Design a protein around this nucleic acid. Structure first.
Ligand SMILES: CC[C@@](O)(C(=O)O)c1cc2n(c(=O)c1CO)Cc1cc3c(CN(C)C)c(O)ccc3nc1-2
Ligand SMILES: [Hg+2]
Length: 565
DNA sequence: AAAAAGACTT
DNA sequence: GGAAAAATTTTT
DNA sequence: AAAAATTTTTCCAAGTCTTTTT
């Protein structure tokens, strides 16, 4: 079939859909109690735990290998939640987590993991088929005239929360989501999904102002989780396409905005100076619009508008550079942002004023928040917000770098290296850093041995040609000449193979501490990539895999070699 | 407002 | 998403 | 065949911006 929704008339404002029907979520299988021979110990004595308490105990047992289970916060949160799950008799015996012995439970689960990787082809194939039919039955939904895939129709099973970074709620229990916690959304004329027998949905609504199918409240942060359509859908795709179109409009007025905030660094009002400086950071350094967050509820991370005095250090001179600002702080996902950046004199002077009479814990930009900044951006350009700058700067950088680095004569592998370097420049800018691949980085040794093996074949082929040429001199004829030809060809193929391996070796090295995934899927206008591929004859499958090819179908079909962001 | 909530994005 | 699993594939 | 290196799914959150409450 293949529906090209991008050729349809743009979907109106307000209403998200007219018709919506789906089968609801897929609940995680019920908890299976431990077999008789897997004992739990408390104070050195065997103790049978009721299903509810035993289940929570298995979560802790499966995480016994991780260092975070030794953490104070983790253990405090865990035991407090585990206690709520216990019967009154169990609560009287188990006064603390340290007297407990989860060793046998831990070994059992490891044994099941070994047993599973030893299953027969009959078992394995059968499990795969049950999944496929579950995908056909619950993985799709009908939205206005078309059938579309649902992203995460299977609700995540219960477990223990860990989060990212130093989270205050790690160790807490993510309780099992039940039909009773589920809010279903569908059209008034669709067939309403039936909850499992003996249960009822929390609510059944018909809200065509939203795009979700199922929603529920998660107990850790108290936020609402959703089941929405997949990236290849029209509702997600159209919104992504609009995001890039917004970034393009920003392109034709960014210099106007830059000239304005540069002047604003001189304004009589402090609020205006701070807003102008913040804008400068978001634009030049692509920092995020740090929305304030509740203290003690989330890991301590910050963005632009939430920077504290302690997050920057001013240096009149550093490394022979003038007016250097030293940024050091934890951003999203607790990823450390460290950068020494030379700034304009007026910005440096402004920052010194913003740090006057303040404590290290106080905000750098008092009198400033994301709401005020975005309100201003909305004045400059309709639909402009803080994050649009990240999309714009990432996209313009990719386009520009692809234009400057691609060599017309290079073979596909070399062009891919160029594409990857351009993507890498975007990643470094967005600070999408990564830690060296868990000792598995030594797989560089494997490539090195392969390159050395190839260098040996190439050297062998050189001696063949060297002796073929020598034999061509003595008794010069067209028969020996064709041998010199066939030897040269063999040297050529080997040189290309070597070149390809060396390029792959360089690609991996330069990409040791960088994560390309996020920019690739969220910050780069796919049309830029599509245009580049078509222009140089690089098969799109070399850049985008199957799932990515589905998400960006709109760009792949609607974008020629002459597309310009 | 300005927190609190909800609904998207990354 | 991106590190860890798991499924495959390649080396030996 | 059996260990080793890859390619491919499986697991699990945190921000931004808009919309309602208080
Ligand atoms: C790791 C980078 C990033 O945090 C980011 O901000 O750059 C992220 C994370 C996650 N996703 C992304 O697209 C991206 C990149 O843009 C999707 C995603 C889904 C996750 C789900 C699945 N949900 C949505 C059902 C979890 O349950 C828990 C953690 C998850 N983390 C992520
Ligand atoms: Hg960026």
């Amino acid at each position: 079939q293949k529906w090209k929704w991008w050729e349809e008339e743009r979907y109106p404002e307000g209403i998200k859909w007219k018709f919506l029907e789906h089968k609801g979520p897929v609940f995680a299988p019920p908890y299976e109690p431990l077999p008789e021979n897997v004992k739990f110990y408390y104070d050195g004595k065997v103790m049978k735990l009721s299903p509810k308490a035993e289940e929570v105990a298995t979560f802790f047992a499966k995480m016994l290998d991780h260092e975070y289970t030794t953490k104070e916060i983790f253990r405090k949160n865990f035991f407090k939640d585990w206690r709520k799950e216990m019967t009154n008799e169990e609560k009287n015996i188990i006064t603390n987590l340290s007297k407990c012995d989860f060793t046998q439970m831990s070994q059992y689960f490891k044994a099941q993991t070994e047993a599973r990787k030893q299953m027969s082809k009959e078992e394995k194939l059968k499990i795969k088929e049950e999944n496929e039919k579950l995908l056909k039955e619950y993985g799709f939904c009908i939205m206005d005239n078309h059938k579309e895939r649902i992203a995460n129709f299977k609700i995540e099973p219960p477990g223990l929360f860990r989060g990212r970074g130093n989270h205050p709620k790690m160790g807490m229990l993510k309780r099992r989501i039940m039909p009773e916690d589920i809010i279903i959304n569908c059209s008034k004329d669709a067939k309403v999904p039936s909850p499992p027998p003996g249960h009822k949905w929390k609510e059944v609504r018909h809200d065509n102002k939203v795009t979700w199918l199922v929603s529920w409240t998660e107990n850790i942060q108290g936020s609402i989780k959703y089941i929405m359509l997949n990236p290849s859908s029209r509702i997600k795709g159209e919104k992504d396409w609009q995001k890039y179109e917004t970034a393009r409009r920003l392109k034709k007025c960014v210099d106007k905005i830059r000239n304005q905030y540069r002047e604003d660094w001189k304004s009589k009002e402090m609020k205006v100076r701070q807003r102008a400086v913040a804008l400068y950071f978001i634009d030049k350094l692509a920092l995020r619009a740090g929305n304030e967050k509740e203290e003690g509820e989330t890991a301590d991370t910050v963005g632009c508008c939430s920077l504290r005095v302690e997050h920057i250090n001013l240096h009149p001179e550093l490394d022979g550079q003038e007016y250097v600002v030293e940024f050091d702080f934890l951003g999203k996902d607790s990823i450390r942002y460290y950068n020494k950046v030379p700034v304009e004199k007026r910005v440096f002077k402004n920052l010194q004023l913003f740090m006057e009479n303040k404590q290290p814990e106080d905000d750098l930009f008092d009198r400033l928040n994301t709401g005020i900044l975005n309100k201003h951006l909305q004045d400059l350009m309709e639909g402009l917000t803080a994050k649009v700058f990240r999309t714009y700067n990432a996209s313009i950088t990719l386009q520009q770098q692809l234009k400057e680095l691609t060599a017309p004569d290079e073979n596909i592998p070399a062009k891919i290296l160029s594409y990857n370097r351009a993507n890498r420049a975007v990643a470094i800018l967005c600070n999408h850093q990564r830690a060296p691949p868990k000792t598995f980085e030594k797989s560089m040794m494997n490539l090195q041995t392969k390159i050395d093996a190839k260098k040996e074949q190439l050297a062998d082929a050189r001696r063949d040609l060297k002796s073929a040429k020598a034999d061509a001199k003595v008794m010069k004829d067209a028969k020996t000449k064709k041998v010199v030809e066939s030897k040269k060809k063999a040297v050529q193929r080997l040189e290309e193979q070597l070149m390809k391996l060396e390029v792959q070796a360089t690609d991996r090295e330069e990409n040791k501490q960088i994560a390309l995934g996020t920019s690739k899927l969220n910050y780069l206008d796919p049309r830029i990539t599509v245009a580049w591929c078509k222009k140089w004859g690089v098969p799109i499958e070399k850049i985008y895999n199957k799932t990515q090819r589905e998400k960006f179908a709109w760009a792949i079909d609607m974008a020629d070699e002459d597309y310009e962001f």
